[PDB]
Structure 1
Amino acid sequence: EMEKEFEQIDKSGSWAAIYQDIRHEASDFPCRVAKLPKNKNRNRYRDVSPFDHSRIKLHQEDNDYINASLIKMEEAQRSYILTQGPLPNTCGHFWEMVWEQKSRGVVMLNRVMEKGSLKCAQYWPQKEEKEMIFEDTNLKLTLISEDIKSYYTVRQLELENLTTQETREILHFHYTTWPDFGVPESPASFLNFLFKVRESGSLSPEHGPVVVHCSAGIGRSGTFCLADTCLLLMDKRKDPSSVDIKKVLLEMRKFRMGLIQTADQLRFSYLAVIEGAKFIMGDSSVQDQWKELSHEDL
């Protein structure tokens, strides 16, 4: 039981050691493309790069590089694209990726400004009448509507390929109260948010991989994906005890480095999955409970 391990780790206060063990056992693959001189201004952080084997390639001849990784969870049967918060010069690239990968949703777990510093470019329109056009990738983005909650906002966007004039509806799920290098306010608010994303169909197999990002695309983004995958695995077998969170995390780290940046984010991941297990195992009412406990209204 993940709960037994949780109490065992909690009692001995060994989260730091457990987390460090994961870092030590984590995969290490080359990131040659990310490190090419020409891509220097396409990376937000020097120490966070996508592995060559799992990087998302832009469908363009000039330069197909973008700091984004495809996390393909074979057993769980779900894929996620984790990427860094778009830079002022990579916003066109970001939307090009969303278009080419056929993503239906974008999950943003950070705020544009955190700790008094800019962690992400304003890559989506904030006002309906002020659409955005990315000339480099020939894409147009328009805000259609938004639903603001106390700690998260859901926006309906229309992305248009100006070359073919084809358009697609993209859902933007913005978690606005998750501290950089921190954890959500409670498993409830986090789970409420995850299921909001799930209910939208953005994580569904009929669509391309959901795009998930924070500032570097590994900490909060990793926590989000780890929790989701663990719950999906548990759901497929209806066997909570069969899910090994640490092994799932190590599996995800074969696709992108540093997923889950702190021992506390790891601990939170356990909490989210344990609590989420109640819903998965048949207690549908718990979903309404999370919504209430999250106080999303206002």
Structure 2
Amino acid sequence: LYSRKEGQRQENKNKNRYKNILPFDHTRVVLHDGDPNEPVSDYINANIIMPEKSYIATQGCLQNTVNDFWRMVFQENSRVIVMTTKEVERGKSKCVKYWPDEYALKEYGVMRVRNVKESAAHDYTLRELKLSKVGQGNTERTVWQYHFRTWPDHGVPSDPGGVLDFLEEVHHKQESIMDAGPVVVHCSAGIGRTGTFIVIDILIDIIREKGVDCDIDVPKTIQMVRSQRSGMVQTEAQYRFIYMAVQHYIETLQ
């Protein structure tokens, strides 16, 4: 009940930044209505992560997966994107530029993206973009891209403050959009940094509906998200960052 067949198919080998980091088939994001000329067009390295508000854990775009990325965003109806990495860190590409330059607009396949406005904050940049299907400007929607950019080249942030203030914002943005789709989260492989944010965001929403006293079980939550995408949270720094984040959030509310 836990296969990764599709991700291993010969035709999707170029659609993964790491041959060894693949999506489970049951939680795999299936892409419909793609170019009928392509051998396979229903694939993208991304999994739906639903607590048990949903999330989409994926890798940063590859030069050849950018259109797939937007098709996913359009289909799933996502309205918020969380980029947890720079395009390149320590001379290594983690995500290709998949959004247009300021005030510009590009067409990625059948998807038109207009960069409406870019605004900076301490740890991140917010990009207001308009997504629509070419020729059908009756499908346009705004997608808010939250680009975290101060994450350290090595290890994790020494203080959770930034990430928390960041996620509070992403949070209210998501709840201000009527029935917005899953929140897309992505880093280089979509498991390490990506898992950490999601796990944190998940635990924080609990402390929201519940109170600063509810039963919080980190290992259980992590285990839970890993059953939907393996690798979620890969380092000890990340692991401990989650604990710190949660405690910091608690102490903040007080």
Q: TM-score range by the shorter chain?
A: over 0.9
Structure 1: give runs of 5+ residues left out of the alignment.
Answer: 1-27, 284-298
Deviation per residue, 1:235-282 (Å, 9 max, x gap)? 222153501011000001010010011011000000001111234xx5
Aligned length: 248
Report the TM-score, using the length of structure 2 for normalisation. 0.92
Alignment of 1:82-121 (within 5 A): 82-121=57-96
Q: Distance in 2 between matches of 1:203 and 1:109?
A: 22
Q: Distance in 1 between matches of 2:213 and 2:2?
A: 31
Match of 1:243 among 206, 213, 216: 216
Q: CA deviation at 1:233?
A: 1.8
CA-based RMSD of the aligned residues comes to 1.8
Match of 1:79 among 54, 57, 78: 54
- One-letter amino acid matched to 1:143: N
Q: CA deviation at 1:161?
A: 1.0
Asked if 1 retains the 8 angstrom alpha-carbon contact of 2:115 and 2:128, the reply is yes
1:205/1:164 CA distance change after superposition, 3 Å: closer
Asked if 2 retains the 8 angstrom alpha-carbon contact of 1:110 and 1:215, the reply is yes
Matched, 1:70 2:48: yes
Q: Distance in 2 between matches of 1:155 and 1:99?
A: 17
Structure 2: give runs of 5+ residues left out of the alignment.
Answer: none
Structure with the bigger RCO (C-alpha within 8 Å, sep 6+) is: 1
- SS of the counterpart of 2:239? helix
Q: What residue in structure 1 maps to residue 99 of structure 2?
A: 124
Asked if 1 retains the 8 angstrom alpha-carbon contact of 2:212 and 2:250, the reply is no
Match of 1:164 among 136, 143, 150: 136
Report the TM-score, using the length of structure 1 for normalisation. 0.79
Asked if 2 retains the 8 angstrom alpha-carbon contact of 1:197 and 1:203, the reply is no
Matched, 1:226 2:204: no
Q: CA deviation at 1:231?
A: 1.4
Matched, 1:273 2:246: yes
Asked if 1 retains the 8 angstrom alpha-carbon contact of 2:29 and 2:46, the reply is yes
- SS of the counterpart of 2:205? helix
Match of 2:107 among 116, 133, 140: 133
Q: Distance in 1 between matches of 2:178 and 2:220?
A: 23
- SS of the counterpart of 1:243? coil
State the percentage of identical aligned residues: 38
Q: Which has the larger radius of gyration?
A: 1
